């Protein structure tokens, strides 16, 4: 079983995407049915989604962090791998999915990869994969070696300006005024420009979050 502090991937069952995570605790629950193995529950924190906090996860939704990249030339059809895709904008970078390679081709213009991409619901067949050099071998149970040297991956939603670095201020990511990431619960989101504002950084400030439908910032006439 995966150890405490072990860097791992964790699968968001709503969307099928895999996410860098770190094991915080391991709870071993006893089986409901005879001849069934004990149920390992992993409590995990997300590397770049700490806001979610520690989450309970089933051992099927957790596997050893992805370490090895398979090279273009080494990819063959039928292979199941983890690769990047964006269901909102396939040209642009997105999230990390498990997919079965369906078509591989090399034109004079560029190298093309297609795979069936597993999402929350089901597959998505013969998708045009564009990050062709960032195709990860899925770490198989049993084989490998604990990752206690994190192999980070470039993920879709990053900020161009602060690179999501939590030790930098940013007036894009975070509060538009101070650029601070603290008390995000007390940061109103403009319903027009989608900018964030601490309640206390507003002038005049607010003591708590308004209970109305929409909220606009000053610039957006409020």
């Amino acid at each position: 079983l995966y150890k405490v502090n072990e860097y791992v991937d964790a699968r968001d069952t709503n969307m099928g995407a895999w996410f860098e995570a770190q094991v915080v605790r391991v709870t071993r629950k006893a089986p409901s049915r005879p001849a069934l193995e004990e149920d390992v529950i992993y409590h995990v924190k997300y590397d770049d989604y700490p806001e979610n906090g520690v989450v309970q996860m089933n051992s099927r939704d957790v596997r050893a962090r992805a370490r090895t990249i398979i090279k273009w030339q080494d990819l063959e059809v039928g292979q199941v791998v983890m690769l990047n895709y964006n269901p909102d904008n396939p040209k642009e970078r997105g999230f990390w999915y498990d997919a079965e390679i369906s078509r591989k081709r090399e034109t004079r213009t560029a190298r093309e990869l297609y795979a069936n991409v597993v999402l929350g619901d089901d597959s998505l067949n013969d998708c045009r994969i564009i990050f062709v050099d960032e195709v990860f071998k899925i770490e198989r149970p049993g084989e490998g070696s604990p990752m206690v040297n994190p192999m980070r991956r470039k993920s879709g939603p990053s900020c161009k300006h602060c690179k999501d670095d939590v030790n930098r201020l940013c007036r894009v990511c975070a509060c538009h005024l101070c650029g601070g990431r603290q008390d995000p619960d007390k940061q109103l989101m403009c319903d027009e420009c989608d900018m964030a504002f601490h309640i206390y950084c507003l002038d005049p400030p607010l003591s708590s979050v308004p209970s109305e439908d929409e909220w606009y910032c000053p610039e957006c006439r409020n």
Binding site: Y49, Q187, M189
Partner: peptide, 25 residues
Amino acid sequence: VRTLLSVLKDPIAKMRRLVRIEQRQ
């Protein structure tokens, strides 16, 4: 009313925000 925390939780919404922000004008 919507908060940054509620966004930062939803990985899609998080990403969708960034685009709305960067490609606006």
